[PDB]
Design a protein around this ligand. Structure first.
Ligand SMILES: NC(=O)C1=CN([C@@H]2O[C@H](COP(=O)(O)OP(=O)(O)OC[C@H]3O[C@@H](n4cnc5c(N)ncnc54)[C@H](OP(=O)(O)O)[C@@H]3O)[C@@H](O)[C@H]2O)C=CC1
Ligand code: SF4
Ligand code: SF4
Ligand SMILES: [Zn+2]
Lengths: 95, 208, 111, 95, 370, 48, 176, 114, 287, 126
């Protein structure tokens, strides 16, 4: 999902693409600007928002001692899903 | 306190206490401190005139043999007028013990060149002259060893910063290698790690 | 003896009287030294102890395991250097009272 | 190894050390990899109900050094007992 | 790599100035601008042939200052790798002495055996040579299951191989002719020039830091250090080979006397905890975090210690502010002490004998810089 | 993979020609293995 | 305890002295050395055929400096600066920013390959196992520009494989 | 106040040793510029020598003068041997710019050097 | 203009200095010293070559880490040249073999090469284009060399008119041609008066003029300080060196001043004479 | 041994070898470093740091780093008294700016005063 800026080349998942008045574009001559084309924010919509019947619930990360540490997040925001700062995946409550 | 914390012997402490009291009272011309740490390694703190007499005493006398010589460095301490500390470190073949003869000295007045009784001290004193500039009158040869020749600054001080002032590069202009003022490629970052909150209550000093 | 364990040091044949004239010269040069200091006391006490070790025994190997300084000829060499400090400490007056003090905020460590 | 007996005998005749026995090419006693996963021990702590950290505070046991001096006494002792000479160990010394 | 300016009456000598300092790198200054745990690998790599006794001496300097004893399995594992390092430095010093004296092949024999030993370091930590791996507070991240039997294998095959080294050399007629008459050392010289370890073993005086002041569990194994008699370079060669064979002894008794305690200290305010408590604690997470950011505070004072590097007296002298940065480290190097007496060791010989003299006191030239 | 050789000659790759397309019949590089074979070939396991 | 050497004498008995003379005038133990060396000739030498056969290793080698990511998830690095706080030649360079979502992330994650001594400290210091020392050690880089990793190079290198890294960690996440 | 100096009593002995050290450098120069196969006129090298002397004439404290005399003696030894190479001897010179003068406006163009 | 062309701080070793220079040539002599002084200034240099990368390898580490950059150019296509000058502050043109090749004359390198590069340059929008020329290259006789250079001079003067057309006299230095031919002798002796100019003042002048704006449009000519006879100079060469057809014609041909155009004194650089540097460079004699 | 000693000043800057550009142009500053306000603990006090003033730090044009032509940029010298600080700075030659030490001012607070009656210091919350 890359943009082609009017400079004419690939962009990244950081707003760092160049101006026309640059020498760094011409130091890219002959060797390709390699970049991961599996971006970050688009792997949020691929994750479904799970709905747990509890209230103050858990996040571990898919593996005991493999990942990010335990964090317990709350679901008081009635319309806003809880978001682990480490994981990036969401949760809901079912009464 | 007993598992995983190293226990000690007070017996060695009492022995070193008595021995340091003895040495201090039988060479009273130069002794100002005999301090004993917790784990029994002796320190004797000495005026910079009894270098030759005290070391001639400590090489011999059959109560403290101590032939073996080691490190000499003069740990650079500002907030003093006598900045540098010449540290002799001595080992006894006969008694298995370590005594640190710390003598103090200033920037420009020499200590008296311990190489007369210590043939190991030759390159040690040459190293101290090269890294610091502590002079040694009555010495055979003082040169710059462990530095470049055309380099100067006496770099192991605190006034000499981490990078050198000069930096070499080859250039084809004059077909040889030259020195330039330092053009770092990165900053050498500096982390203010000196956290507050008094991690040792015993070593507090009285404030003003 | 026969070819001692040290290297630059060949065995001596008459250890006893050589050692005795060594320690009597120690007593002589100690007699040069002034009186009131206890440096004379400690050197005189240890030297008379060691001379009493050696006068009481004409042995060899018991004389080694009693008189410390194994094996033997180190005691002779150490007596020479003890004479060397004796000669160097007629001068230089180690027992006389001190030359002046440091600025007294120097020897405390934690800065 | 892996060679006929005539040249084996020539190796052992050039050096009578039974070279075919242990040859410094390992075959059997390579450690058979993918071992079972180990469970570590936890030592003399995590012991509940008694571990006051107040006791085993080895950082805070650092005394400042005692200070004997400034700026008919039964003395002239050595710093240590004088060191006893060792023994030739029986296990085939020379001679 | 050295510079040697010698002044010779013909095919003989008179004097030699060792210009050293080609390999000065500023190690003490860089440690004065870093923390303890960060600046451990400088201690790992000032010497480089011996490589884990340097770790061992720095870790004992910090543990002795910090008044914390490691658990016993840490001490015995540290003894095992001290023996591997002793074995390794003496076998390379013998082979580089042989290669520089001539003698192409035993170099490569013993370097294949050393290639097994670098495989063992790889399996322990992962690095080939400069494995840090010895934290202050005891060893970090203990051995994978299936290593001790490999060390047992190496002990058997390597006893066979070192007996084959003495099969090749040692009653070599012309190697004995090449190095017997050179390198005399008086006992007064061995004291005044400040020699360390193998020179003292070789010339006279029975002396060992390991035996006299057992700084670890070395006091509880049967081994016996070889001494020299004539104070001589061939005699010094035999002294090195028999210290290797004593190291075989110490490895055998170490494997048979192993206690299964624990890796690190449980005083978690010095060594960082492990992953399980790290991923669910609070105190262990905080200790992990700040212990790697700041470095633990170290009480003020100046200590010194020294262990027996296979060169000699590897000494290290710390001066600590109440701080997490050491105020001044300094290192007593047996390479420096052994290069220190070169004129009086080589007043009466010729230049190939001088190259043999540089061989017969084991040099790395990294450590001679301090 | 053969068993009767010693440890260091068990597992050997035979490269083929033009896997990326650069005439690699000759001039065989390293790292022309996929990563699971980069675990097996470097003696980190005992199973393919 | 001590066990020293060289304490003997040449035996004055006629058999032993004529044996030393026979070795002197007959060049004997030199030929004994030749026999030992020919015994090593007739062994099979231990070489590995390098570009095909690769020399063995551990599961815990320290190589490539690769990154990881979550299961079908985003970048594992929080940009918590611990690796640059521990990096003993400071080759890490982290500049962090949040994005439009809210989770804290990076901007610039640079490893110098020149200064990187390959400790392992940044692996041990990482709380989430973001940076991992990789398995393969083949860099061989013809230009010095090309030895300065960007975060995108690290992510591509973490997406040229995880399976090796995952197998190594999943074997040895129990020691460390 | 007790200060134990190196050699000096007044600056007469300072003047004496420093004029002898300059004489040593004068007979030091042509031998070295011939030995290292250098490429500089003898006039220029000697004038840079005396310019380096005339830089530090502003110090009267005699211990400082003693330490200067000992430094200059050290490097006269180390260039009267062949211990220093061509690089260090040229490094005393500045034939590679180093262009920067002390004009105000020049340092105002190439900015932020007050 | 955008940032990172503005100068930053002091000078030397990847201090971000001003100019970004595309150089055609620089694998030869004068361009190599010119890249050297721009590396001392700390300027990013884009140079394309055409030969084996071993030659640009032994002149590679003149810059700091990754400053100078290498690519390819050819004497035929505008696309490779245009790609090489897609982004440039300045561009300098220094080219020429001093004998005809199989595929190139003195014509069409001096003619055809400045045509296409000035075409894509003036369509590209470069500034401060510096074109070298041999001194006293006329419409007059004796050299296809000199007359093709005069045609190229008229080309670069006419199209893209504010180019600094620069000309030194015939230079000497560490890798001189004519002093090397003075060493590679045997002999023949004629008369011609001649001024030699040393190479480092020339390249110092070129870098100073290219970094100092407002001095544009004018052709310059560089002056030797001595200006005496050729045969006296050959006797000087043999004296200092201890031992007793196109190149020889093109040193016998023309050496004069041109009073129209301004020289060294509009730049503020000290003239290094023949004698000092000639004694410095005449090594490689007997012992 | 009871030699020349003359009571004067010191001139070490002609010996420590740092060039005169850095001598006369760069400027020192002596201050107790302030309590970093978010924590409230003053073990970071009690010391007198000597620092040098900052200078130019451009962009490293290949990586986005901050190079500098300042070898003295990362000096710090933590001292214990203002007198020895000034003595060292004047001994080593360069100029220096002295900022004085500031303790927290002692106060007069009490919990009973937070429970006032007709005084306005009233807790109002708890
Ligand atoms: N005394 C003197 O020599 C003076 C010389 N000049 C001028 O200065 C310039 C540089 O001189 P100099 O260095 O001595 O000579 P060079 O031949 O070394 O310089 C020309 C450069 O351009 C390259 N080049 C030339 N023709 C071609 C081509 N057809 N295709 C590709 N590359 C080409 C050369 O070889 P390569 O392709 O291998 O890179 C070389 O790198 C010349 O134009 C000369 O006329 C001016 C005044 C005095
Ligand atoms: S320690 Fe790990 S998560 Fe933290 S900044 Fe470094 S790589 Fe990222
Ligand atoms: S391995 Fe060490 S040097 Fe390399 S990035 Fe990690 S911490 Fe830094
Ligand atoms: Zn989570």
């Amino acid at each position: 999902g890359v943009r082609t800026s009017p400079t004419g080349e690939k962009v990244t998942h950081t707003g760092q693409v160049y101006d026309d008045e640059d020498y760094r574009r011409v130091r890219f001559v002959g060797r390709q600007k390699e970049v991961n084309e599996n971006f970050a924010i688009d792997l949020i919509a691929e994750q479904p928002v799970s709905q747990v019947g509890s209230r103050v619930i858990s996040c571990d990360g898919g593996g005991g001692a493999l990942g990010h540490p335990r964090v317990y997040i709350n679901l008081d925001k009635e319309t806003k899903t809880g978001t682990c700062g480490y994981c990036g995946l969401q949760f809901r409550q079912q009464h | 306190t007993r598992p995983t914390v190293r226990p000690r012997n007070d017996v060695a402490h009492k022995q070193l206490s008595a021995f340091g009291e003895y040495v201090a009272e039988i060479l009273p011309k130069y002794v100002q401190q005999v301090q004993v740490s917790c784990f029994s390694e002796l320190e004797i703190c000495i005026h910079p005139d009894g270098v030759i007499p005290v070391l001639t005493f400590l090489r011999d006398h059959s109560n403290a043999q101590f032939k073996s010589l080691a490190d000499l460095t003069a740990v650079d301490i500002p907030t003093r007028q006598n900045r540098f500390e010449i540290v002799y470190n001595l080992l006894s073949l006969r008694f298995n013990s370590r005594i640190r003869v710390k003598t103090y000295t200033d920037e420009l007045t020499p200590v008296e060149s311990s190489v007369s009784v210590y043939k190991a001290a030759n390159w040690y004193e040459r190293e101290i002259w090269d890294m610091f500039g502590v002079f040694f009158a009555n010495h055979p040869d003082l040169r710059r060893i462990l530095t470049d020749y055309g380099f100067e600054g006496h770099p192991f001080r605190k006034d000499f910063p981490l990078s050198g002032y000069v930096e070499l590069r080859y250039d084809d202009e004059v077909k040889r290698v030259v020195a330039e003022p330092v053009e770092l490629a990165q900053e050498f970052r500096k982390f203010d790690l000196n956290s507050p909150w008094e991690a040792f209550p015993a070593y507090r000093q009285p404030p003003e | 003896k026969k070819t001692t364990g040290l290297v630059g040091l060949a065995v001596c044949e008459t250890p006893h009287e050589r050692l005795k004239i060594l320690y009597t010269k120690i007593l002589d040069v100690l007699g040069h030294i002034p009186k009131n200091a206890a440096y004379r006391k400690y050197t005189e006490q240890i030297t008379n102890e060691k001379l009493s070790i050696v006068k009481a025994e004409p042995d060899v190997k018991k004389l080694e395991e009693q008189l410390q300084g194994g094996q033997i000829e180190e005691v002779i060499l150490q007596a020479e250097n003890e004479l060397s400090l004796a000669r160097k400490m007629i001068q230089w007056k180690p027992w006389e009272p001190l030359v002046e003090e440091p600025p007294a905020s120097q020897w405390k460590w934690p800065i | 190894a892996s060679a006929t007996r005539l040249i084996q005998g020539l190796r052992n005749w050039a050096s009578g050390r039974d070279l075919q026995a242990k040859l410094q090419l390992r075959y059997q006693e390579i450690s058979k990899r993918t071992q079972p996963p180990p469970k570590l021990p936890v030592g003399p702590s995590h012991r509940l109900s008694n571990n006051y950290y107040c006791a085993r505070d080895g950082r805070r046991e650092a005394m400042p050094p005692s200070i004997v001096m400034s700026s008919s006494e039964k003395k002239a002792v050595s710093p240590a007992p004088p060191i006893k000479r060792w023994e030739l160990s029986q296990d085939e010394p020379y001679l | 790599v050295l510079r040697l300016v010698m002044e010779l009456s013909g095919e003989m000598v008179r004097k030699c100035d060792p210009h050293i300092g080609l390999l000065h790198r500023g190690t003490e200054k860089l440690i004065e601008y870093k923390t303890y745990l960060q600046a451990l690998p400088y201690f790992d790599r000032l010497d480089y042939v011996s490589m884990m006794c340097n770790e061992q001496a720095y870790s004992l300097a910090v543990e002795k200052l910090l008044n914390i004893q490691p658990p016993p399995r840490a001490q015995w594992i540290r003894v095992l790798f001290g023996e591997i390092t002793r074995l390794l430095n003496h076998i390379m010093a013998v082979t580089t002495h042989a290669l520089d004296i001539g003698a192409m092949t035993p170099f490569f024999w013993m370097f294949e055996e050393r290639e097994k030993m670098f495989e063992f370091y790889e399996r322990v930590s992962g690095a080939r040579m400069h494995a840090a791996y010895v934290r202050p507070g005891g060893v970090h991240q203990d051995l994978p299951l299936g290593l001790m039997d490999d060390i047992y294998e190496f002990s058997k095959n390597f006893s066979l191989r070192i007996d084959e080294l003495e099969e090749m050399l040692t009653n070599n007629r012309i190697w004995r002719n090449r190095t017997v008459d050179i390198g005399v050392v008086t006992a007064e010289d061995a004291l005044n020039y400040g020699f360390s370890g193998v020179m003292l073993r070789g010339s006279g005086i029975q002396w060992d830091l390991r035996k006299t002041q057992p700084y670890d569990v070395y006091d509880q194994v049967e081994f016996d250090v070889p001494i020299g008699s004539r104070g001589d370079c061939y005699d010094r060669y035999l002294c090195r080979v028999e210290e290797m064979r004593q190291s075989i002894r110490i490895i055998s008794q170490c494997l048979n006397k192993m206690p299964p305690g624990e890796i690190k200290v449980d005083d978690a305010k010095v060594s960082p905890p492990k992953r399980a408590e790290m991923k669910t604690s609070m105190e262990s997470l905080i200790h992990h975090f700040k212990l790697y950011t700041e470095g633990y505070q170290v009480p003020p004072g100046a200590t010194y210690t020294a262990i027996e590097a296979p060169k000699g007296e590897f000494g290290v002298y710390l001066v600590s502010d109440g701080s997490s940065r050491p105020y001044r480290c300094k290192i007593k190097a047996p390479g420096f002490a052994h290069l220190a007496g070169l004129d009086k060791m080589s007043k009466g010989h010729m230049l190939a004998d001088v190259v043999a003299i540089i061989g017969t006191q084991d040099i790395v030239f990294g450590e001679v810089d301090r | 993979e053969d068993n009767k050789q010693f440890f260091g000659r068990h597992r050997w790759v035979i490269y083929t020609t033009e896997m990326n397309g650069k005439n690699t019949f000759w001039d065989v590089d390293g790292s022309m293995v996929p990563p699971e074979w980069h675990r097996w070939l470097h003696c980190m396991t005992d199973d393919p | 305890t001590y066990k020293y050497v060289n304490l003997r004498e040449p035996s004055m008995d006629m058999k032993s002295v004529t044996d030393r003379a026979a070795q002197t005038l007959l060049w004997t133990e030199l030929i004994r050395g030749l026999g030992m060396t020919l015994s090593y000739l007739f062994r099979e030498p231990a070489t590995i055929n390098y570009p095909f056969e690769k020399g063995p290793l551990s599961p815990r080698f320290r190589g490539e400096h690769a990154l990881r990511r979550y299961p079908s998830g985003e970048e594992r690095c929080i940009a918590c600066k611990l690796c640059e706080a521990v990096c003993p030649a400071q080759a890490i360079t982290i500049e962090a920013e949040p994005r439009a979502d809210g989770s804290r992330r990076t901007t610039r994650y640079d490893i110098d390959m020149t200064k990187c001594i390959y400790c392992g400290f940044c692996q041990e210091a990482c709380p989430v196992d973001a940076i991992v020392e990789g398995p393969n050690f083949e860099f061989s880089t013809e230009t010095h520009e090309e030895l300065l990793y960007n975060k995108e190079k690290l992510l591509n290198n973490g997406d040229k494989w995880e399976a090796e890294i995952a197998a190594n960690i999943q074997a040895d996440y129990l020691y460390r | 106040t007790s200060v134990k100096p190196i050699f000096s009593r007044d600056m007469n002995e300072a003047k004496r040793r420093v004029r002898e050290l300059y004489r040593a450098w004068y007979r030091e120069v042509p031998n070295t510029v011939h030995l290292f196969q250098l490429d500089i006129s003898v006039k220029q090298g000697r004038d840079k020598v005396r310019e380096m002397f005339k830089k530090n004439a502003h110090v009267t404290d005699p211990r400082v003068v003693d330490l200067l005399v000992i430094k200059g003696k050290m490097e006269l030894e180390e260039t009267i041997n062949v211990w220093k190479q061509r690089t260090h001897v040229m490094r005393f010179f500045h034939e590679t710019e180093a262009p920067r003068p002390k004009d105000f406006l020049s340092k105002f163009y190439v900015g932020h050097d007050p | 203009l955008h940032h990172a062309v503005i100068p930053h701080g002091k000078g030397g070793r990847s201090s971000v200095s001003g100019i970004v220079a595309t150089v055609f040539g620089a694998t030869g002599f004068l361009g190599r010293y010119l890249v050297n002084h721009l590396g001392r200034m700390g300027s990013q240099v884009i140079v394309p070559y055409r030969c084996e990368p071993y030659d640009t390898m032994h002149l590679r580490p003149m810059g700091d880490l990754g400053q100078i950059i290498f690519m390819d150019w050819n004497g035929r296509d505008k696309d490779s040249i245009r790609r090489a000058v897609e982004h440039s502050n300045v561009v300098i043109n220094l080219v020429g073999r001093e004998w005809e090749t199989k595929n190139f004359d003195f014509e069409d390198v001096f003619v055809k090469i400045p045509q296409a590069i000035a075409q894509v340059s003036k369509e590209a929008g470069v500034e401060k284009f510096i074109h070298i020329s041999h001194l006293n290259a006329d419409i007059k006789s004796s050299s296809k060399y000199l007359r093709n250079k005069a045609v190229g001079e008229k080309e670069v003067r006419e199209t893209f008119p504010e180019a600094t057309i620069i000309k030194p006299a015939d230079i000497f230095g560490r890798e001189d041609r004519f002093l090397n031919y003075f060493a590679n002798i045997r002999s023949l002796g004629k008369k011609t008066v001649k001024q030699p100019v040393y190479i480092v003042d020339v390249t110092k002048g070129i870098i100073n003029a290219i970094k100092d704006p407002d001095a544009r449009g004018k052709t310059f000519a560089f002056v030797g300080p001595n200006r005496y006879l050729l045969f006296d100079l050959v006797q000087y060469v043999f004296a200092v060196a201890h031992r007793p057809r196109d190149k020889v014609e093109r040193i016998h041909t023309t050496d004069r001043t041109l009073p129209h155009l301004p020289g060294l004194e509009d730049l503020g650089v000290q003239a290094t004479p023949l004698e000092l540097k000639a004694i410095e460079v005449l090594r490689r004699h007997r012992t | 041994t009871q030699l020349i000693t003359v009571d004067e000043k010191l001139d070490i800057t002609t010996l420590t070898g740092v060039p005169e550009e850095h001598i006369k142009t760069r400027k020192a500053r002596i201050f107790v470093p302030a309590r970093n306000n978010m924590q409230s603990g003053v073990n970071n006090t009690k010391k007198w740091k000597m620092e040098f003033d900052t200078r130019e730090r451009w962009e490293n044009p290949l990586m986005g780093w901050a190079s500098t032509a300042d070898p003295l940029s990362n000096l710090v010298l933590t001292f214990s008294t203002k007198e020895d600080a000034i003595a060292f700075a004047e001994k080593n030659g360069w100029s220096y700016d002295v900022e004085e030490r500031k303790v927290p001012k002692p106060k007069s607070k009490s919990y009973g005063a937070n429970f006032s009656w007709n005084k306005r210091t009233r807790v109002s919350t708890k």
